[PDB]
Write a protein that binds this ligand. Structure first.
Ligand code: Y01
Ligand code: R16
Length: 80
């Protein structure tokens, strides 16, 4: 399945990741600090669920494809 992981990251995947990043940044900029229970916060929290799911899916794909700290050139070998 590692070849599938390699091919998924190339199937226009960076653009989708960037779109998710931008939309989640706008979602962060749209929160209401003072009204902690207003419906806007309720919608943005669902948006945050979606963005968290997408990001953790990408992170798991990266773990599987590149491998953990066991060797250089893998996950945790970058601060990013
Ligand atoms: C090149 C990059 C840095 C562009 C940056 C643009 C956005 C990061 C910022 C600029 C001003 C922000 C907006 C300022 C406050 C509003 C109102 C906010 O809530 C409302 O619509 C008011 C109605 C209500 O409170 O119920 C929704 C998000 C929004 C559009 C924000 C969306 C994100 C915005 C567009
Ligand atoms: C994603 C960024 C855009 C969110 C738009 C605002 C959604 C919630 C506001 C409508 C309810 C009042």
């Amino acid at each position: 399945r590692r070849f599938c992981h390699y091919i998924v990251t190339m199937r226009y995947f960076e653009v989708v990741i960037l779109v998710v990043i931008a939309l989640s940044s706008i979602a962060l900029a749209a929160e209401d600090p003072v009204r902690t229970d207003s419906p806007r916060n309720n919608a943005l929290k669902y948006l945050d669920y979606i963005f968290t799911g997408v990001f953790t899916f990408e992170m798991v794909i990266k773990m599987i494809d590149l491998g953990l700290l066991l060797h250089p050139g893998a996950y945790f070998r970058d601060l990013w």
